[PDB]
Amino acid sequence: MVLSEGEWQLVLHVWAKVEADVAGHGQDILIRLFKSHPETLEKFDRFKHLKTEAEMKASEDLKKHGVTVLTALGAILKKKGHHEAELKPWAQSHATKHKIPIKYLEFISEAIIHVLHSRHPGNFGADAQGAMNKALELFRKDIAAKYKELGYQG
Ligand code: HEM
């Protein structure tokens, strides 16, 4: 798939707002993921012990990982489809070290859209959501192909 420039502009315009508060958005997104699909929490030996939303919100460690996640994702989106070099080391660790199935990437994709919609309604109308969805689908497609190359395709 290929996004048009107008679609990239919609994605990067809401992303610019997200970057006004990277830590807060990262926390919101990971907490939404873990609440909506608690099985994903099991992949994180680091966070496995967190029992309630309250404990999640109070974890400095979770907040630091959310910054790491959104910073990496941001770097990929700003490549506007030219993200081959960035995707390679990402795919290798998520496939053979952490073992993250494509299904879980769909789940975090859903969490990202939920948080953007909730915090940025005026810059995240139907057309901008459609563009963000297509960018994240482009990302999952490319990761699926890489997984396969790497011998995981999970
Ligand atoms: C937008 C999707 C995601 C991005 C951009 C992302 C990014 C990252 C980055 C940059 C790291 C640190 C370096 C590394 O280990 O490769 C990391 C670690 C990790 N990720 Fe992801 N990730 C994503 C989705 C997920 C999902 C869906 C899960 C699990 C359900 C996951 C599980 C992990 C684990 C277990 C670690 C190691 C945490 C630790 O330090 O103990 N990732 N991720």
Side-chain angles (χ1 to χ4, degrees), residues 3-80:
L3 272 72
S4 68
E5 175 70 11
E7 285 173 340
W8 286 118
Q9 288 307 302
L10 283 173
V11 162
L12 295 171
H13 172 78
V14 71
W15 197 254
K17 308 298 185 200
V18 168
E19 288 179 335
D21 174 26
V22 178
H25 285 83
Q27 201 166 22
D28 281 359
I29 282 159
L30 282 182
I31 288 173
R32 159 114 299 228
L33 176 65
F34 297 152
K35 275 228 290 278
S36 297
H37 312 271
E39 67 267 33
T40 58
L41 189 52
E42 277 180 311
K43 289 288 181 176
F44 293 83
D45 288 341
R46 248 171 99 200
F47 303 136
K48 227 157 51 224
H49 69 289
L50 302 176
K51 281 161 200 268
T52 64
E53 177 162 4
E55 274 171 17
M56 292 180 194
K57 296 179 133 251
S59 162
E60 228 15 70
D61 222 45
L62 191 278
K63 173 175 81 9
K64 195 225 96 291
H65 188 65
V67 174
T68 292
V69 170
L70 287 194
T71 304
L73 181 60
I76 287 160
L77 291 175
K78 290 166 181 176
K79 290 311 280 307
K80 296 163 74 178

Side-chain angles (χ1 to χ4, degrees), residues 74-145:
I76 287 160
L77 291 175
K78 290 166 181 176
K79 290 311 280 307
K80 296 163 74 178
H82 297 97
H83 51 227
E84 308 70 51
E86 290 71 13
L87 234 52
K88 261 149 77 147
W90 183 98
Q92 182 176 47
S93 82
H94 282 77
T96 135
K97 180 36 199 322
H98 315 306
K99 268 93 181 176
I100 309 309
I102 291 294
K103 171 68 104 133
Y104 290 11
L105 295 177
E106 277 162 17
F107 296 158
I108 195 165
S109 293
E110 163 191 313
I112 287 158
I113 290 159
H114 176 95
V115 169
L116 297 198
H117 171 79
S118 162
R119 289 183 64 145
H120 307 284
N123 291 306
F124 205 66
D127 289 341
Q129 181 173 330
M132 185 59 81
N133 181 62
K134 188 162 177 210
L136 294 174
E137 298 195 347
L138 174 66
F139 180 60
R140 303 202 295 272
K141 172 162 128 296
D142 282 357
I143 290 297

